[PDB]
Amino acid sequence: ATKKAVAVLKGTSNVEGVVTLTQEDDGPTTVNVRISGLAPGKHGFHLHEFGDTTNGCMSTGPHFNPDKKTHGAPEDEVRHAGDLGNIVANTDGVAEATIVDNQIPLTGPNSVVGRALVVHELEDDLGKGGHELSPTTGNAGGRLACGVVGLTPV
Amino acid sequence: ATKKAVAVLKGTSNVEGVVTLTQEDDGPTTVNVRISGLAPGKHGFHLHEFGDTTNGCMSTGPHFNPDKKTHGAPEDEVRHAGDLGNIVANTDGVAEATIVDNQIPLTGPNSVVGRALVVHELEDDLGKGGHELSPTTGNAGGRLACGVVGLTPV
Amino acid sequence: ATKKAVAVLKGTSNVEGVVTLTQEDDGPTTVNVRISGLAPGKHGFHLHEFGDTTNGCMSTGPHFNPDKKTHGAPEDEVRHAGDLGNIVANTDGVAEATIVDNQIPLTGPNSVVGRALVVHELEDDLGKGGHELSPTTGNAGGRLACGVVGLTPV
Amino acid sequence: ATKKAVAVLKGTSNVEGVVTLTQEDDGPTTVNVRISGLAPGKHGFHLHEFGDTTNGCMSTGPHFNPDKKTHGAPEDEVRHAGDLGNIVANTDGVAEATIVDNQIPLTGPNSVVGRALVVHELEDDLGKGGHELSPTTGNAGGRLACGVVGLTPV
Ligand SMILES: [Cu+2]
Ligand SMILES: [Cu+2]
Ligand SMILES: [Cu+2]
Ligand SMILES: [Cu+2]
Numbered sequence: 105a106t107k108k109a110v111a112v113l114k115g116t117s118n119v120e121g122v123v124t125l126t127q128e129d130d131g132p133t134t135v136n137v138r139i140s141g142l143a144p145g146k147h148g149f150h151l152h153e154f155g156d157t158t159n160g161c162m163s164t165g166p167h168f169n170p171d172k173k174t175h176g177a178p179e180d181e182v183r184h185a186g187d188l189g190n191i192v193a194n195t196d197g198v199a200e201a202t203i204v205d206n207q208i209p210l211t212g213p214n215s216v217v218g219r220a221l222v223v224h225e226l227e228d229d230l231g232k233g234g235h236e237l238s239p240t241t242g243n244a245g246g247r248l249a250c251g252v253v254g255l256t257p258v
Numbered sequence: 259a260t261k262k263a264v265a266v267l268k269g270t271s272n273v274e275g276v277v278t279l280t281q282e283d284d285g286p287t288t289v290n291v292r293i294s295g296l297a298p299g300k301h302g303f304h305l306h307e308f309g310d311t312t313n314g315c316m317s318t319g320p321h322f323n324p325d326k327k328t329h330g331a332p333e334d335e336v337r338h339a340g341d342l343g344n345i346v347a348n349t350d351g352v353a354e355a356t357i358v359d360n361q362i363p364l365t366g367p368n369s370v371v372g373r374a375l376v377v378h379e380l381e382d383d384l385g386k387g388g389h390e391l392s393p394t395t396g397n398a399g400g401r402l403a404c405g406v407v408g409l410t411p412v
Numbered sequence: 413a414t415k416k417a418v419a420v421l422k423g424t425s426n427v428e429g430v431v432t433l434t435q436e437d438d439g440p441t442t443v444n445v446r447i448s449g450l451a452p453g454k455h456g457f458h459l460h461e462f463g464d465t466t467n468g469c470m471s472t473g474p475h476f477n478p479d480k481k482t483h484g485a486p487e488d489e490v491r492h493a494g495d496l497g498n499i500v501a502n503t504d505g506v507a508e509a510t511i512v513d514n515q516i517p518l519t520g521p522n523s524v525v526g527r528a529l530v531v532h533e534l535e536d537d538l539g540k541g542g543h544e545l546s547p548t549t550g551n552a553g554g555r556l557a558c559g560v561v562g563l564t565p566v
Numbered sequence: 567a568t569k570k571a572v573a574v575l576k577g578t579s580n581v582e583g584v585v586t587l588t589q590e591d592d593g594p595t596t597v598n599v600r601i602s603g604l605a606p607g608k609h610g611f612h613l614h615e616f617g618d619t620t621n622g623c624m625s626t627g628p629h630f631n632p633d634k635k636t637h638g639a640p641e642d643e644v645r646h647a648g649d650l651g652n653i654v655a656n657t658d659g660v661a662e663a664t665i666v667d668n669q670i671p672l673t674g675p676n677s678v679v680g681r682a683l684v685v686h687e688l689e690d691d692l693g694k695g696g697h698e699l700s701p702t703t704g705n706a707g708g709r710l711a712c713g714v715v716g717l718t719p720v
């Protein structure tokens with residue numbers, strides 16, 4: 105068995121995007137990301153709790169956090185669950201990244217089907233800042249685009 | 259143990275729409291539907307298989323059919339599973355429908371999370387015709403708008 | 413700079429197994445586990461201090477615990493070091509998983525090269541129960557097969 | 567700053583064994599060997615590069631050779647590093663040796679933690695022979711038994 109899902113990032117900004125999530129057996133997931141319309145630099149890219157979209161991206165809620173932890177980097181132990189770091193945006197405003205994460209499954213409890221991915225305006229602190237929002241958001245603050253993770257064929 | 263979901267409809271037309279689904283215990287589900295920008299009359303309201311959305315609405319696939327059957331009406335035993343009948347537009351181009359189905363859960367195998375709801379341009383046959391697409395689409399055809407069923411707080 | 417290891421588990425039982433551990437630079441470690449001969453359900457999976465093996469599986473000492481902690485779950489601050497939670501066995505007695513831990517390096521101090529990986533008979537408590545051995549073992553007690561962590565190519 | 571390691575030899579044959587290795591400060595290391603049910607006479611006794619063991623002893627690879635040299639006897643300049651020479655089994659087929667070498671450390675680079683000790687079925691040439699594999703395996707080929715060098719309570 106192998107699973108796949110897609111997420112078409114759209115906002116009220118000139119930010120577009122599409123991200124494909126792949127998963128084998130019930131091991132890790134591969135996420136391929138291509139987003140355009142962003143300022144060159146480091147962003148913030150998380151798997152936000154809910155799939156809403158009714159109130160733009162401001163209803164996809166907080167970070168997906170079944171383990172009840174603090175905010176971190178993908179390579180940390182205290183991290184949310186939805187932390188996926190920063191994606192770098194090229195000089196033309198396109199961002200292409202590949203992250204393989206073992207906390208965003210496509211099956212069972214904790215599955216990330218019908219949740220949302222959000223690309224953030226400002227670079228995420230990885231929880232390293234001492235901001236107030238650091239321990240919760242990475243101060244990546246400003247949701248440019250999201251979309252719900254849905255099922256895609258195979 | 260109540261579970262709620264949402265689906266914000268938007269196609270490449272001026273057909274908008276927003277749907278909420280609710281489920282208690284592990285029972286029947288209630289769909290509340292409100293869609294605007296539709297030609298007066300009956301249309302098609304189905305639960306299509308995939309959340310795709312990447313080549314518009316034509317990526318959602320066929321209707322959701324776990325039981326593998328023919329197309330029909332909710333009140334029909336032969337029915338697909340994703341088949342939610344027809345919704346009728348007022349003279350202002352609005353359809354406000356309240357559907358209560360037992361074939362579109364939010365939990366377990368057959369869960370409609372991460373999938374899509376599409377509003378068809380023409381009326382649903384219910385399989386009652388003998389068109390050829392009757393057994394498959396209700397000859398309702400032409401996806402005017404769709405949405406990825408995402409999780410919403412409870 | 414990337415590094416791999418493998419643990420070919422064998423017991424005085426019918427539990428066979430093989431596990432690999434990969435680590436790049438000086439980040440986290442991916443552990444791909446596959447066992448057979450086990451009984452449907454949850455076990456215990458820990459990195460025991462010694463590789464020993466002379467007096468079967470009982471010479472592996474307790475769980476690797478350099479940071480001196482109590483027993484817990486992988487997603488626990490208070491946790492041991494060698495705690496790797498529970499692996500699930502299917503209906504044919506076969507377990508496969510993919511653990512991404514950050515407490516079992518393959519480099520420098522705390523390196524787990526030459527140490528043992530054990531699969532236990534009972535399920536681990538997560539140190540949630542209040543047995544006596546809850547804070548020490550997770551009352552998983554019963555060493556079904558173990559292997560010493562050995563170097564393998566790349 | 568003392569250390570100890572053990573390795574418990576077992577092959578797909580009636581050849582058993584346990585070796586311990588001991589190092590103090592960052593000097594020499596004493597190896598105590600005992601193996602049973604080997605055929606009377608000389609064997610080969612080497613430290614092989616990898617600890618593998620998934621395709622029996624044949625995946626342990628070549629002899630541990632960091633200084634990149636040819637094959638030889640413990641007392642030889644031209645020596646591999648893994649080359650521990652031959653051990654002699656008695657008429658009841660037991661073999662007990664105490665090899666003291668300066669080339670299989672247990673700390674730092676060249677460390678043989680996570681490597682394998684392999685007893686060959688034929689007598690090792692010491693590189694004197696002119697076979698063709700003499701400068702490689704010392705023409706002792708036949709991996710009767712082996713094991714991963716693992717840590718043991720100091
Ligand atoms: Cu975020
Ligand atoms: Cu349809
Ligand atoms: Cu244990
Ligand atoms: Cu050899």
Ligand SMILES: [Zn+2]
Nearest residue numbers: 167175184187
């Ligand atoms: Zn977070």
Ligand SMILES: [Zn+2]
Nearest residue numbers: 321329338341
């Ligand atoms: Zn249908």
Ligand SMILES: [Zn+2]
Nearest residue numbers: 475483492495
């Ligand atoms: Zn423990």
Ligand SMILES: [Zn+2]
Nearest residue numbers: 629637646649
């Ligand atoms: Zn050699």
